[PDB]
Ligand binder design. Structure first.
Ligand SMILES: C[N+](C)(C)CCO
Ligand SMILES: C[N+](C)(C)CCO
Lengths: 287, 286
């Protein structure tokens, strides 16, 4: 316990049917939000309190709209409560589910590719657009201290030169998840894969999501080619160069996100610097 | 030579009063019979349509297509196109550099915008290049049995790619269809010409890219570099489609070779080597 325990009980009893009590409340990991697992008599619930500083990062009204909008696709787990004023959301917790990792993900291509095809060709108009260069400027002005990363102004300029390349290649605007870390995929006992945690989801080019999938799980070149044969279709075209560019933009943006989050109280060790350095490496190989 | 005579006869109407034919030599070439006529002030390519090629190429469409493609300024000047005589006469670019599989690798910045120009031309060429239909076409034209080993099984494998292409999406654009490096000619004034449009037809642009890569044996790094010059919002690129079209080209042109050899040509090992590269491609693709 206890006051956090009290709040969590104070906030999920309205979901508890006649004759039901909370057995235990456990803290979970997580990067964006303050997460808990509430175990009850009948079932378990994921409780997510909006993380430190995230109000500037995520439009929570947009997120709520997007959760409702995407429900019929059946990709995510259920949301039981989404209460913006209280700063809380409660999701279904899938029992005996397996959370994917960078190793186990390599065995699930035939399940992941159709999930991504589903969202990318859904025609869903999400509230909010992910404009990568605008996002960089966003994190720049949110960060109070100077950005700690070496040679930033020059790296930033090299990164911004990619905007013209993207415009020349053509940028698509489709519903995207935006954050394809392997832990966002869970497999239930029946063998059904779910894609969870849509809080960053926004309109973007689908090559962003492919880049994220590949980067976050460190796909090999062969693995990328094999995944792409699962994914590529008339309705889901693939540009390899766009993927390479979005990998650089992602490392750039999330390294900045890390600086912001760490000013808001977090500590992610070397997460931020490692991503930044990978962006620099990506730039050198690209250019 | 009676050859001398008919050549003089044909380009006669192009020459003036004391303008004369200095010499005539035989050129290389795989589809037609080609000759260089050197005259007082101009040099001309004289092309006699190859034996049996009327079955392969619609010459009336080719003439039409020539006219339609003129305002793009890609080809050299055509002076004569006589279907009845079975002859065309083009300008021969003096002291031009004919590109080869080596020199083509230094010309990406000139080639990519040529291919962008044709592929985004919005022009409706007469003739559609449907590769699986083209395979069936060659099979019907070939009189003896196709000599290639295990052909039925290989053909089966090749035809299994029709459905893959349909699932990837097939575009329909004006294409050159025959991008051997020798079809690129560099003038001493600096411009690159793309010549010999006789196979040009509506097709997926990934076919032209596959032909360019395959005929000059691009390395994968060279392909990637080339695609950096070519890829754009208007000219999107699919790596898998390029790989499939390479297999299709090797198959089709191996059959073209059997057909041509039945007309009396001898291309040495060209046919079997292309067929076997399709076999190799199919193995590497699966
Ligand atoms: C959003 N990050 C990519 C920074 C990790 C969160 O899943
Ligand atoms: C048409 N081939 C590809 C067989 C060679 C002619 O350029």
């Amino acid at each position: 316990g206890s006051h956090m325990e009290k709040i969590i009980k104070e906030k999920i009893s309205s979901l508890l049917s006649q004759e039901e009590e909370v057995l235990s409340v456990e803290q979970l990991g997580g990067m964006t939000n303050q997460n808990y697992l509430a175990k009850t008599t009948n079932k378990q619930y994921i409780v997510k309190f909006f993380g430190k500083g995230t109000e500037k990062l995520i439009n929570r009204q947009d997120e709520k709209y997007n959760l409702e909008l995407l429900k019929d696709l059946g990709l995510d787990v259920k949301n039981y409560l989404f209460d913006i004023e209280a700063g809380i959301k409660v999701n279904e917790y899938i029992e005996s589910a397996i959370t994917l990792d960078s190793t186990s993900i390599k065995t699930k291509f035939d399940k992941i590719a159709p999930i991504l095809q589903t969202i990318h060709t859904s025609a869903k108009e999400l509230r909010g657009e992910f404009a990568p260069f605008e996002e960089i400027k966003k994190y720049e002005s949110l960060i109070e201290e100077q950005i700690p990363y070496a040679n930033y102004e020059s790296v930033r300029n090299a990164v911004f030169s990619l905007e013209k390349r993207l415009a020349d290649l053509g940028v698509d605007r489709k519903s995207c998840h935006i954050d394809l870390v392997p832990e966002n995929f869970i497999e239930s006992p029946q063998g059904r894969l779910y894609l969870i945690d849509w809080e960053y989801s926004s309109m973007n080019d689908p090559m962003w999501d492919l880049a994220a999938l590949f980067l976050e799980s460190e796909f090999t070149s062969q693995e990328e080619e094999t995944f792409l044969s699962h994914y590529e279709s008339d309705q889901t075209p693939v540009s390899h160069e766009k993927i390479a560019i979005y990998k650089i933009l992602q490392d750039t943006i999330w390294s900045l996100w890390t600086v912001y989050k760490e000013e808001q109280g977090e500590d992610f060790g070397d997460y931020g610097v490692n991503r930044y350095q990978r962006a620099v490496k990506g730039l050198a190989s690209y250019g």
